[PDB]
């Protein structure tokens, strides 16, 4: 609420009107990372950048094993840091720090799943947005029986 209200009070001061869902998308993409602590039983490093869904999956699999879950705090991070810290290293390589993330990928030997749009623009495949989705490209067309009966 505070972030949305601040940016909307900056924008409303001039007369430009922006709907608040456009801000809410960036804010949702902004608070996605969670910082964890005391991760002695979740067998990963404590006090780094952890994704929310991955952290929840780790919690589920460690309470399935019986171990106590590790604590975590949400981390409001900037657009640049959230852009660099992404799963697909092609998108982060196309951004500012293109030497650090290439070396980071080479050291970590990480291979990127091609879900995304910068990594599908570069290769030249169809982007997975709009017409490029799987549920739209998988249609088969044929005329009806009365149509070919007419001619």
């Amino acid at each position: 609420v505070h972030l949305v209200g601040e940016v909307q009070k900056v924008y409303n001061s001039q007369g430009v009107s922006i709907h608040d869902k456009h801000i809410e998308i960036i804010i949702r993409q902004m608070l996605r990372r969670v910082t964890i602590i005391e991760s002695g039983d979740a067998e990963l490093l404590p006090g780094e950048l952890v994704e929310r869904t991955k952290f929840e999956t780790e919690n589920r699999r460690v309470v399935q094993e019986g171990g106590h879950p590790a604590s975590g705090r949400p981390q409001l991070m900037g657009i640049t840091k959230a852009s660099l810290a992404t799963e697909s290293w092609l998108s982060a390589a196309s951004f500012q720090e293109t030497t650090r993330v290439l070396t980071d990928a080479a050291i970590n030997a990480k291979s990127d799943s091609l879900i995304g749009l910068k990594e599908n623009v570069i290769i030249g495949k169809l982007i997975p947005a709009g017409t490029g989705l799987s549920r739209y490209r998988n249609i088969r067309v044929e005329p009806t029986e009365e149509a070919k009966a007419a001619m």
Partner: protein, 77 residues
Amino acid sequence: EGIINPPIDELLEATDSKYSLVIYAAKRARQINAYYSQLGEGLLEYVGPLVDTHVHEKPLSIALREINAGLLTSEAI
């Protein structure tokens, strides 16, 4: 005599989506244009123009007119 002659909302209510509509009409137009390129080979799986045809127009016009007429359907694989 233009792009706007097929009414777009009729197509939307005939197919309930927009990107499915465009891939649908594009596939139909590709099939029609491949029919015109058969050079008299008589391939059975390639269907000609259903609606009445002028001597020179793009096959996408035939695709949009056919689907606006609503005599053609499809299914998802």
